[PDB]
Amino acid sequence: EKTRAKNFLIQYKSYNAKIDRSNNIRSKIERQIQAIEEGQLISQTGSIFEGIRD
Amino acid sequence: EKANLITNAKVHIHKLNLVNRNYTKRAEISRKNAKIALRRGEKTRAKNFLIQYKSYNAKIDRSNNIRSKIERQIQAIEEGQLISQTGSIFEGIRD
Amino acid sequence: EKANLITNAKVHIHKLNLVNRNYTKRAEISRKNAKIALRRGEKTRAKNFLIQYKSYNAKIDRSNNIRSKIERQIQAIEEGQLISQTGSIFEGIRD
Amino acid sequence: ELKYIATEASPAKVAEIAEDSDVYVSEIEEAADILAGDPEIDLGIDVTDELNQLETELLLSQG
Amino acid sequence: ELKYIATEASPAKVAEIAEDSDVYVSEIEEAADILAGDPEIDLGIDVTDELNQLE
Structure with a gap:
């Protein structure tokens, strides 16, 4: 039933793109958490240097 | 009740499948009558049973395709619903 | 009571079938009288029994076709009624 | 009843x-692909060759 | 009664x-494997060659 066979193959690789869609969205958000971790400490560093100045 | 909304769809799938059992039985029953009527020599009635026999098959296919169409449309709400929430935390990151 | 509506139709099918028993008996009874009247030599009356004999057969056929016509029209409400609900969940998906 | 169905x-x-x-289905799915638009930045800002030394020193170490 | 069953x-x-x-079964079992996530720290922080002398 090679028609149906390649159709299962069509539906088979139909998921793989969707898994990759997830993985890249995960990686993108992990990177954007880190920018709030690193960014948040930089912000406070700026305020004590303001305390030194005044 | 959006869960019950996705529940309800999954419910109807079983009704659609239930009927598909029922008409499958009648299809064979009609084919048995045709085979008899050929042996009766009542070939008019025999091909009429055959006519009514294949009268169901299209209706079964009508069901199967409607089932597949709704399964695919559930999934688009499953996948879609998680995408929506992903968008809101990226909005939380931005602000 | 739409269930009772489909119930009522299925009820009348049995009345229509009941009468079809009754006139079948009278048909043969008339044919017996014809056969006798031929042997009486009363061939006038004999063919009159035959006339009344086949007078029923059309009326039985009249019933059978009315029965088949209503069975088909029940089914269109069975099949139609499920289609209607299918349409409403696809409306729920859309919204 | 046929009328009401x-x-x-x-x-x-x-x-x-x-x-x-x-229409809503293609609106949402494409709105998922632009939700994964950042690979174009990652593949762009980092192009760093120098680690081929870091490879080759590992590779001669592996060799 | 067939109706009630x-x-x-x-x-x-x-x-x-x-x-x-x-779904709950795979949720729990994978939540057991991340409950054993620390081998990745143990295999990382200690790499000590020197005991090959001690060997």
Whole structure:
């Protein structure tokens, strides 16, 4: 039933793109958490240097 | 009740499948009558049973395709619903 | 009571079938009288029994076709009624 | 009753609600791909060759 | 009575409660493997060659 066979193959690789869609969205958000971790400490560093100045 | 909304769809799938059992039985029953009527020599009635026999098959296919169409449309709400929430935390990151 | 509506139709099918028993008996009874009247030599009356004999057969056929016509029209409400609900969940998906 | 089913299984409404769903489906799925748009930045800002030394020193170490 | 059994052995409900259990099963078992996540730290912070002398 090679028609149906390649159709299962069509539906088979139909998921793989969707898994990759997830993985890249995960990686993108992990990177954007880190920018709030690193960014948040930089912000406070700026305020004590303001305390030194005044 | 959006869960019950996705529940309800999954419910109807079983009704659609239930009927598909029922008409499958009648299809064979009609084919048995045709085979008899050929042996009766009542070939008019025999091909009429055959006519009514294949009268169901299209209706079964009508069901199967409607089932597949709704399964695919559930999934688009499953996948879609998680995408929506992903968008809101990226909005939380931005602000 | 739409269930009772489909119930009522299925009820009348049995009345229509009941009468079809009754006139079948009278048909043969008339044919017996014809056969006798031929042997009486009363061939006038004999063919009159035959006339009344086949007078029923059309009326039985009249019933059978009315029965088949209503069975088909029940089914269109069975099949139609499920289609209607299918349409409403696809409306729920859309919204 | 056939009239009352045919009022609400009207093919004028079946075809409407089926077309509406398909538009929203392609709206959402493409709105997922632009939600994964950042690979174009990652592949762009980092192009760093120098680690081929870091490879080759590992590779001669592996060799 | 067949009606009353078929109301509550409904295949609409059998298939629901069977699917729900499987999701919770894989949720819990994978939540056991991240409960054993620390080998990645142990294999990382200690790499000590020197004891090859001690060997």
